[PDB]
Structure prediction request, 1878 residues.
Amino acid sequence: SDPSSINGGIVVAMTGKDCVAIACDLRLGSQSLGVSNKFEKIFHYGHVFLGITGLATDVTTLNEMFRYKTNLYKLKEERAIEPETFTQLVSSSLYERRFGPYFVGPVVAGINSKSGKPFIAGFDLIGCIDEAKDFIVSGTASDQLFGMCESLYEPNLEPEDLFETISQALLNAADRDALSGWGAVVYIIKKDEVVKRYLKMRQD
Amino acid sequence: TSIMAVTFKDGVILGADSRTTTGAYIANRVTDKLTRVHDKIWCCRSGSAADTQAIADIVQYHLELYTSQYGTPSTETAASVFKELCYENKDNLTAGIIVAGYDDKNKGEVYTIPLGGSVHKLPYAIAGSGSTFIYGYCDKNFRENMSKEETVDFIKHSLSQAIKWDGSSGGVIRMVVLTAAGVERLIFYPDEYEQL
Amino acid sequence: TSIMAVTFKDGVILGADSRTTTGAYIANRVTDKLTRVHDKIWCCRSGSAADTQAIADIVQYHLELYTSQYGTPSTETAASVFKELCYENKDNLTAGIIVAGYDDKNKGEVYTIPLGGSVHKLPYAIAGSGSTFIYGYCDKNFRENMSKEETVDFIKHSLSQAIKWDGSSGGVIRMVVLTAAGVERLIFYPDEYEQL
Amino acid sequence: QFNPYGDNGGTILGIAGEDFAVLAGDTRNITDYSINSRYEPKVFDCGDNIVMSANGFAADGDALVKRFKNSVKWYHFDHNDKKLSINSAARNIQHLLYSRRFFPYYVYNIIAGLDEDGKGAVYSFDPVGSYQREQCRAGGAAASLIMPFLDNQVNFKNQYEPGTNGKVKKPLKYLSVEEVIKLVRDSFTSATERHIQVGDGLEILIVTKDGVRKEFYELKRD
Amino acid sequence: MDIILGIRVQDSVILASSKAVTRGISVLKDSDDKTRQLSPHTLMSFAGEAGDTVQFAEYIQANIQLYSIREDYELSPQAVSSFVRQELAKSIRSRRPYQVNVLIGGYDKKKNKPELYQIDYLGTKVELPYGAHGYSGFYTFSLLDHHYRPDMTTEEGLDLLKLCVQELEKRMPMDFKGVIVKIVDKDGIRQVDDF
Amino acid sequence: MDIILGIRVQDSVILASSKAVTRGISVLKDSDDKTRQLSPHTLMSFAGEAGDTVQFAEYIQANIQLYSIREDYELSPQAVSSFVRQELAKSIRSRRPYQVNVLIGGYDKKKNKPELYQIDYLGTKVELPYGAHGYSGFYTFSLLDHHYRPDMTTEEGLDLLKLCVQELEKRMPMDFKGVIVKIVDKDGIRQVDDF
Amino acid sequence: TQQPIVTGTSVISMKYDNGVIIAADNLGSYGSLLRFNGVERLIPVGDNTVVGISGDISDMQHIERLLKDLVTENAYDNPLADAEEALEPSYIFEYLATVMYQRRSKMNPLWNAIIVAGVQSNGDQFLRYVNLLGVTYSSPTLATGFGAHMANPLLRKVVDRESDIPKTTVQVAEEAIVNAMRVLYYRDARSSRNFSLAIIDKNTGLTFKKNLQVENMKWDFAKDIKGYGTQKI
Amino acid sequence: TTIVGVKFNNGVVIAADTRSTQGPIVADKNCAKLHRISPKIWCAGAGTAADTEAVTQLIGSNIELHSLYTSREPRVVSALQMLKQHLFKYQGHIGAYLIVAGVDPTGSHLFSIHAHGSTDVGYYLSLGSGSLAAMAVLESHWKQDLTKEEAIKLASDAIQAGIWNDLGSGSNVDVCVMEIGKDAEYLRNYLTPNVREEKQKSYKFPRGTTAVLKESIVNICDIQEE
Amino acid sequence: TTTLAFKFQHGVIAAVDSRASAGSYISALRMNKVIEINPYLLGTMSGCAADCQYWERLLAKECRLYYLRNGERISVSAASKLLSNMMCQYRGMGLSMGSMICGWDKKGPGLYYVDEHGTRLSGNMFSTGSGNTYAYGVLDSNYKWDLSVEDALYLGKRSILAAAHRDAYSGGSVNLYHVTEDGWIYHGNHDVGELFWKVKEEEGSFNNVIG
Ligand SMILES: *[C@@]([C])([C][O])[C@](*)(=O)[C]([C]C1=[C][C]=[C][C]=[C]1)[N]C(=O)[C]([C]C1=[C][N]C2=C1[C]=[C][C]=[C]2)[N]C(=O)[C]([C])[N]C(=O)C1=C([C])C2=C([C]1)[C]=[C][C]=[C]2
Ligand SMILES: [Mg+2]
Ligand SMILES: [Mg+2]
Ligand SMILES: [Mg+2]
Ligand SMILES: [Mg+2]
Ligand SMILES: [Mg+2]
Ligand SMILES: [Mg+2]
Prediction:
């Protein structure tokens, strides 16, 4: 019944030294029933990454909407949108449905192409921004992720170290959540290279 | 309902209106709400008439039995019996009772027992739906050690105002005077108290 | 809330307490409930603060526009604007307003507008949760054509009792005097009115 | 309508070593958004080298502990001062809990001690009496924050040995008391940060063959 | 309606849909075809609330047929599935949503690949090798998880489908009156008349 | 449980009862015998809420078996049916009633007559030539009203019963997994193993 | 199950170096009506304990009687009733806590919040809370109802932890309590100006102060406040 | 949340804590609750966080356009009037509870605003779950004719009361001082009394600990030439 | 949960998962859902964990008392009936308990399904819990009476795996039991995480899943 927990799923993002990481599980379900193990929840518009948890129809719908809006932004501005700007766009777009909201928990991740500064942000379903320095969490295992991230995280981690930290935070949180898991993906993001890694995890 | 009990120099006076309603219909316009539980211990009843009649009847029974064994009971003792009934059966009762009596030792005493079954000893007490409208008047005009005539006027004026504003209150004003001299019943009709 | 407006020989006086509650918490203990809609037309507000502020602001706007076109409006006209808002939006409002003003022709006038949006012209009016406790006192002590000092004492004593019994009422007593002489604001602190 | 239950917050944590056991809990007591006490002990030495904590609704938790302590007392009277083993205590507590199957003790209970072979033991319960022996368990408000961390750092879950790439797991080496206390302090420090009902103080009870020892550590008071 | 199944094999997509229609306590029909051809190489099966299902399917059919005539070109199964999803996602926030779940089986003539899309009434789209709606998956997915290969023939796909229906017929309380099976491949859409 | 039928012919009573048992969305058993022998010439079938049915039937069975031993005598079907009715009428005003509907088929050895009694969970008893409980009668009574004669043979009774089950299997939405048929006559109770 | 009718508001308390202080106003409210103005909600038990009660007054009067009867019963066949075997604060509290938890377990609670303040035989300070649910806790400062939200913050600035208790004098503690009572009068709509205060000291014993008033109140700044936004007159 | 507003001699100061929560969980430990409507008009909000932001940015936008239209510096009564009329229109469905403070050519101002559209005036105010803890401090220590330094102290002490005693409030103290004839000074993290202590252990993993199935380069660049 | 049990030529197989849930939160990864009532009697657990543990351990008390009074092991039929009678006393009081009583007695191997409604069913194959539908799918298509002990153990193991994969409230590990006329034999704890990848490779199943 609760739209934010019908399909299940989780997203987590972390900052490091001159890098950011964002990761998600691959499960899509109908409550107890597992339907897909290939439902990726992370999208990118240029070099800005967006992870979305919650109701799958709204996840799909919002991706298509922000693809729409960022493609027009780029045609008019003659440049790719930056994370700080995209974050405001997400917040604006969600609040315009204040009394009929998308049931989602979005997470922005990326590096400013000009300043080189790593950036992450989170929102509630209605657009309130959470601009944290350390990490952002979202999904049905958000409590589990908060506990893992708060204990495992330390600032100024290198890309290959940050990978291990975010992977372990996600994996162990997902293994304590019935509605998350069935595979996982981690994006490691640097100023001019992005690596994508599929994790091996228990399939129950 | 508008009921009150007031202590004064020579003892205590109970006062009440005479209206009983079933919604907006006046089922009885000459009700006697001043009820006797002992020779010189009377009570004013408010709330469910069934509940308050049942209680006062049980109290009257207890005090009659007390008297047979231990002699004349105190006003405090009577209030304790009311309380014990109102408190232990608070889930199934809707009763707001004022207890008033005269001793030669303790003189005039007034106890009020609201819904929950708590007891409060006071110089004077007011209760019933019409009491709300005279809290200010009674507080401003009450004095300790008034004369009988002063106290009768105080109750008459007070209940006159309660009747004037409360639709659930009305009819005649009944009063019972409790002194060493005995027990005096009084009555005051609309044409008397309305023009005050 | 405890609010009242009283006419007298030289004009009219509005009075109010200063307590605003959110349940049992006192959100504001120095509220100003005496609000101006025109130079010498003021109102006392009761009910939803949001609703009564929104209304009085709209009324102030209408009377400012009236004045620009047709000259100084009557107190009756101001009460009609309040009424029209309170009556037509009665399903979505919880407002109990007392309107009071001074003309040189009509002198001091008082109108009360309870929940439904009806209008009642009166010599004096009381409203708010604390008014219930002083219906009897105010009815007994009000006279027509009182002096300014008599009227101030009447309001002070009345609201003192309302504050004393009503938990939703309290703080300071604010008053606004409306006469030909002008507009005088008054204030009375607890140490003054509590000992009455 | 009268609600007979309440929530006094708090969080508890039990870890079993090779020859020891720990039972920790924060000392904060709360209702809604207010603090009742910054130091209200939650973990108790119940006798016979057994420690216990009933977390959730404090009134029910205090009643259960009080009843079990009493059960230990009567076990000595009835059975010639025989030592109540940890497995026997656990089974006894199941029956105390299920006596109220239709008006439950609203608590998550954990006990810790040593088994009859001298090895560290932790037993965990649900509010109605289902219990089982475990190596690691967090209970209470921040249980969902802490448990995954313990799966990772105590049982080395999702951890593999470098170079093999997921073919060979991390071996399950036992933990010392010094290493366990670090995980406990870090668990509660992390929970204090992200959970509003956790903080003020941390009290740890360590159980060895030598007896029951206490350690106290301050936590953030916001 | 009740049960709709779908499976994507090597060179085709197979859709199986129940034949029963019930009003009150009476089965009014035991030969109902819960499907519409959207285009020569795209088939959509459907299940949900009474009336809404057919109305929605026919509305989609009309829109795709309109596109085909306008452009003289068949839309890809992916394009059709996205169009259908948007209509359902649009519908879920309407005054009265259309309570319809669909499977879209199509053969992409450009890529020479069969494609199966599962879309529920909320507008939740997923591409799958095999799919179902409602309770159908609870009984059948364990068999499909076990037996399914991507290089299966159409005949092997039908045999695995028979096993799924047999399991449904054994463990489901409801009598769905068998299934109509249709195959979608490079040559178009055809019905298996004996099943 | 679901469907229980009964028919009284010339010289016997025939009871047909479904084989299905369902918990949640899964059919746990397709060979369940919803009946108990109360005495050598008295059979009771039953249907109602889970658990209550068997508990009630076995409780009745124990009471009749106790009577048989005590008196060394078989109670008449009428006497047994009255005993059962009273227990249900007693039950309906209890704290938690037993939600069980029954058919009692018996052969009265004294009168040399078959007898069928229908009793619902309220304690509503009726003697009938043919009977059913729940929705079963909605489908079958029209056939029985048409074809039934009182001088029918046991074989004709079974053929008419087959027609009733075929109608149920066609028009009922639920799959009740066929029926177990039992015949009660002068020689006692026997089961028709092929139906 | 019931609902409270006539109620008493906050009870506040704190520990200091040689004992405990407890305070509560003298009001008995009937919903929003300030009905009864002479209600004592601090009830001494012997010369070493004071029980402060908030919530339902009829249930308070019942508890008041249980305590009076407890003293009577303790004196029975007890030559040391005014010495070694006198009632201790810890005994009185545990009795009440037992009663409260039993009544909630029968779904017929005493609709109260109680603070038991006193000094034990060994001179140790006793301060413990119990309510209608049978929930118990202890702290250097304790307060019921609104006092929990407004008084505790002020009293915790004086005694923030256990180690601040020996550093806190009776003059400082009393001053903090009296200030807290003033703040409650400003901000609690079901409070009164009149209140009672009790000090239990291990040296000077039990001091029970009646008919105290909130004084030194700030109201003058109200004259300057006009309107609700834009009004100037 | 704990927020306060305090008037003084030549201006007004507001302050807030820095904890944001989603239930009993702390989402952000260093949230910025002090928002800007105009350069010298700042507000702070409790309740629904998205509503307090949206309504603040909306009115701030309209205030800026108004200021440009009238060639005048924005007034606090304008922000107040625009906010309450907006909130009243949505009948409390926009859960914005704000303390609004600022300086303008008329002088210094301090208002509170509730979600249904009611406004209040005061010399000292408090809002949020920690409002009672803060108000106890304000009622104890506030006086007439405060100085700038006394008012900042009173304000931050009031916020601290909320931090320590209210579970909905915590972490740091933000302050903004608006003095007449001066630029407003925003003091982000004016106080930092809740720094996390050093952890006992480092949880940095050995490289290779996590099992991996597939690696791939993600193309974030546009389509290339040649 | 997911549990199953079935009779076959060489006795009865019993297989269960080990997960426990409190909403979406996985409260336990490794719970024993089998009770060893006696050397020839087993009991599976599904539903309220507390109810399952209390009543099945109370059954074991009552089954032990039977042996002492009669000098003979209780039958599977009688044991299942005692349990179903316990359920009938707390009829409508809110218990939640689904169990299979597995064992070997004089009639040979025995298997009974019992639930909180007092239902008692005899049969060759049963499966209970949130993931029973997934297990039935594998069982029904692969079950025979002529199964070897090795193949039968694998079937029950593979059937739980199917459920653990699809059902969100089933998983953790698999516990296997084989009941013979010499008593039950425990065939170990099998982590689903490791078992899944192993079965995927060796069997070729779960082709859709990537690994
Ligand atoms: C499936 C995992 C879930 O349906 C299975 O049914 C298990 C069966 C099981 C049997 C024996 C032992 C353990 C599990 N059921 C549960 O896990 C039940 C499901 C359930 C939750 N609420 C509920 C259920 C069933 C029927 C009515 C209501 N889950 C539980 O019993 C929950 C309450 N228990 C726990 O989360 C905890 C357990 C057990 C446990 C905890 C928590 C802590 C310490 C020890 C044990
Ligand atoms: Mg999982
Ligand atoms: Mg699973
Ligand atoms: Mg307006
Ligand atoms: Mg007052
Ligand atoms: Mg904390
Ligand atoms: Mg879908």
About this structure: The pocket of magnesium ion (ligand 7) is lined by residues A 35; E 118, 120, 124, 126 (CB under 6 Å). The radius of gyration of chain E is 16 Å. The first helix of chain E runs from residue 52 to 71.
